[PDB]
């Protein structure tokens, strides 16, 4: 304390699960340390989709329950928290760096760097060669006369470049191995290389937790962070922690397309936040050696990113599903029921039971799905306008002997005074095991198909109860033929 | 929920060797059906055969059932109204019934050897088919008397009826044997002694069994036993024909009856490893049956409430140790901590594995491991570093963790442990964090591994800081210091 971490997405595309794992990892580490979770928008590079993507990002956080302490709408003391709003800041930090001799204007063309390499006997594949560090005022003025627009480069220290990664351990870049790197484009506009460390510095970030795909930037950032201390615009260097990249089934960067990388796919299918967060938390981390099922509070209590491993994290849609199922079954019945009603409703999949019978049906299926979406197939026989008898079922369960069973079942069921669950059971086993003498599963079968359309459904008798007497009788009577 | 009304079922093993899972499944399945139905579970011992049967087997049978927490309503010890319940005590009953069958002409004395279908003579029909002769049905009293004079010793055979023998198996559905497809079968050997073909239906009839639940390996006996049951009604020994329900033989990896060679088949192999009754019961119930379509974890009381053998399925029931292991683990978690602690202490103790911690310490240690084993036997390798006489440094772990990276870690950990003011897991952990992770800048993984190996001797153990607490300061220091050297 006081830890300060940062989720700093660029508003491009849908949130993928890897990105969302990083948000959760930061969130949990703040909440665990009693520190602060900063939400910074990296929107100096706008594309067509950028508002759409912005809204998607806040929606994602807002669905999974990961509130932010500083950032959009909510504000905070180190604002602003959109980078598109911070250009004055970036121009003044650049002015200060230049004034202090920490950075310099560089005018080399790629061809000119190439040529110097060639004159040296070196391979031109090497980058920038720091040439422009030694420019005379004459040479710099001559460039500007011709209308060369320079980039600003940071002067790297000439000694070894290392840090103790919170995940990886000590990482090392050999002396002299990282060229003076550009902070601006020729138009003057700042780069990721400036605005990302600039804003970590100014927003007093203490711990940077990010995908290990960015690990090569770290020596550059540390050099800038060190420069920023020198010019008096920060006082501390952040620690870094580089998360294992989330892979798909291949060894490949979880692709931008394969739907198992996209958070909205999961949501749309009917993951609940508790299920998805539990799964995300397991991409690089385990709460203990004896279990992997847990809630967000338990995570917050336990989460420390030094316990994140650097080993391969591969996305496993079987384990995801399994965890969601358990987390669905973990819900109290009322909560599950409201969530299930909403999910069905908002997918154009309203079930035509009133509040009380729907609540009964919800509790029937809670233990019988993996995702909220599974309930439509289970449940939809309860609407007249979705009833369809499956041909297979109607070929098993509807045939000649179907007639025998449909007949006796019809006898059986008519006479029940009360369509309450606890009785219908006894009518049919009487008729169909009792006197037809075939297995209890053919006593009830052809009922099921006649009532629901399918050989698999919710528990028969509650389903008959909830169907109602009149609809049950009607469907059975129509079936037999 | 419906039954037969007076359901009476039996478990009727012959004591040979150790109780196998197939047989115990059958016992469980009968017991659960009886209790489901308000019915009576009869335990009949089939000890006619002296070559095979054994007190040692008998004793093992009875210990198996009681370990599982089954009981019986009639049988050994308790007796009952239709005794005696060892077939070995019953010889006069079988002689009487055999006499009655002969007098009524249901059975006959046969002097020929036993038709086997390997070779038969065309039955006389328009569509030529193979049939059995059953020639000795037709011997004259005069021929039989001659044969006896000549010293020939007949068996008694039952005359099979001339009609189709079927039944509606509660598991298998309808099964039919068409007229002629079963030879007249012997009820005795030449010595006069009855065979199981007599004594099993005899005693079923006589003990008023209503439902026969048994392995499907016995299913071909059923038409014979139907015929005898029917004759026993005719001669007044029996009242009704029982129902049959033939349970899926459990399948190895091959398609075969799980081998009595296979360790998986022995109930006591699971017992010895540290299966608990709730665990093994649960799985055995799953060999041909499921309580519901949404869960497979349940206790005996739920099993009783639910079980009707007509719900058993006739599919391959493959024994799967990983599944049995997983359900026992779940049942071990499910226990209250104190109950678990006693069972675990008892198991270690009786296996010559007592753990040398006091009552409070052992109970803390038990709670640590309750969630980290699948059988009680696993506790041993987990826990046994708490015994000074069992402390051993794994060579691979030493060479890995107690070379020179080594020195810094151990030195710092010894300093910091000295500094701990009260010997408790949170203060040990705080001290060790602050010396190793803050101080030495290490990844925690790397920061503890040497500590773990020093304290415990191995690179996986119980949760480290609790393990250090229960070892105590003096012991932790000593092992940690010795590893330093």
Curated annotation (Swiss-Prot), chain A:
Entry annotated with the keyword Aminoacyl-tRNA synthetase: yes
UniProtKB keywords: Aminoacyl-tRNA synthetase, ATP-binding, Cytoplasm, Ligase, Nucleotide-binding, Protein biosynthesis
SUPFAM superfamilies, alphabetized: An anticodon-binding domain of class I aminoacyl-tRNA synthetases, Nucleotidylyl transferase
GO terms (BP aspect): glutamyl-tRNA aminoacylation
InterPro entries recorded: aa-tRNA-synth_I_cd-bd, aa-tRNA-synth_I_codon-bd_sub2, aa_tRNA-synth_I_cd-bd_sf, Glu-tRNA-ligase_bac/mito, Glu-tRNA-synth_I_codon-bd_sub1, Glu/Gln-tRNA-synth, Glu/Gln-tRNA-synth_Ib_cat-dom, Glu_tRNA_lig_a-bdl
Binding site for ATP: 256
Principal subcellular localisation of the protein: cytoplasm
GO cellular component, one term: plasma membrane
Reactions catalysed according to its record: tRNA(Glu) + L-glutamate + ATP = L-glutamyl-tRNA(Glu) + AMP + diphosphate
Pfam families, per the entry: Anticodon_2, tRNA-synt_1c
Protein location: Cytoplasm
UniProt short sequence motif 'HIGH' region, positions renumbered to this chain: 9-19
Gene Ontology molecular function terms on file: ATP binding; glutamate-tRNA ligase activity; tRNA binding; zinc ion binding
Motif stretch ('KMSKS' region): 253-257
Keyword flag Protein biosynthesis: yes
Domain of life of the native organism: Bacteria
Record-listed E.C. numbers: 6.1.1.17
Additional detail: Was identified as a high-confidence drug target.
Family listed: Belongs to the class-I aminoacyl-tRNA synthetase family. Glutamate--tRNA ligase type 1 subfamily.
Complexes and interactors: Monomer.
Job description of the protein: Catalyzes the attachment of glutamate to tRNA(Glu) in a two-step reaction: glutamate is first activated by ATP to form Glu-AMP and then transferred to the acceptor end of tRNA(Glu).
Protein name: Glutamate--tRNA ligase
Gene source species: Mycobacterium tuberculosis (strain ATCC 25618 / H37Rv)
Top-level taxonomy: Bacteria, Bacillati, Actinomycetota, Actinomycetes, Mycobacteriales
């Amino acid at each position: 304390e006081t830890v300060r971490v940062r989720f700093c997405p660029s508003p491009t595309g849908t949130p993928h699960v890897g990105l969302v794992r990083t948000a959760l990892f930061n969130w949990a580490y703040a909440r665990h340390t009693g520190g602060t979770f900063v939400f910074r928008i990296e929107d100096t590079d706008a594309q067509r989709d950028s508002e759409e993507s912005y809204l998607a990002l806040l929606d994602a956080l807002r669905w999974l329950g990961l509130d932010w302490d500083e950032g959009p709408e909510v504000g905070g003391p180190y604002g602003p928290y959109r980078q598109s709003q911070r250009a004055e800041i970036y121009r003044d930090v650049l002015a200060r760096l230049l004034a202090a001799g920490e950075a310099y204007h560089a005018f080399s063309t790629p061809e000119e760097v190439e040529a110097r390499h060639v004159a040296a006997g070196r391979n031109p594949k090497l980058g920038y060669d720091n040439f422009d560090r030694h420019l005379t005022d004459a040479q710099r003025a001559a460039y500007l006369a011709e209308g060369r627009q320079p980039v600003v480069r940071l002067r790297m220290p000439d000694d070894d470049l290392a840090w103790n990664d919170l995940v990886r351990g000590p990482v090392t870049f050999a002396a002299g191995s990282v060229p003076d790197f550009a902070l601006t484009r020729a138009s003057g506009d700042p780069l990721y290389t400036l605005v990302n460390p600039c804003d970590d510095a100014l927003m007093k970030i203490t711990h940077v937790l990010r995908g290990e795909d960015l690990l090569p930037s770290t020596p550059r950032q540390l050099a800038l962070h060190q420069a920023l201390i020198r010019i008096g615009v920060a006082e501390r260097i952040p620690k870094f922690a580089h998360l294992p990249t989330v892979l798909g089934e291949g060894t490949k960067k979880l692709s931008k397309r394969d739907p198992q990388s996209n958070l909205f796919a999961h949501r749309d299918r009917g993951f609940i936040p508790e299920g998805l967060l539990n799964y995300l938390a397991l991409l690089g981390w385990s709460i203990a050696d004896d279990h992997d099922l847990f809630g967000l509070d338990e995570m917050v209590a336990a989460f420390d990113v030094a316990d994140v491993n650097s080993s391969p994290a591969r996305f496993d849609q079987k384990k995801a599903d399994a965890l969601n199922a358990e987390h669905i079954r973990m819900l109290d019945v009322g909560d599950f029921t409201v969530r299930l009603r909403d999910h069905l409703d908002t997918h154009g999949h309203h079930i035509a039971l009133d509040e009380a019978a729907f609540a009964a049906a919800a509790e029937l299926v809670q233990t019988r799905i993996v995702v909220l979406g599974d309930a439509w197939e289970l449940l939809k026989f309860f609407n007249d306008d979705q009833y369809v008898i499956d041909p297979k079922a109607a070929a098993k369960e509807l045939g000649p002997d179907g007639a025998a069973v449909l007949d006796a079942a019809l006898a059986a069921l008519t006479s029940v005074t009360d369509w309450t669950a606890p009785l219908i059971e006894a009518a049919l086993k009487d008729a169909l095991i009792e006197g037809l003498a075939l297995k209890p599963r053919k006593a009830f079968s052809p009922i099921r198909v006649a009532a629901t359309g399918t050989t698999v459904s919710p528990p028969l008798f509650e389903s008959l109860e909830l169907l109602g007497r009149d609809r049950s009788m009607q469907r059975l009577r129509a079936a037999r033929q």
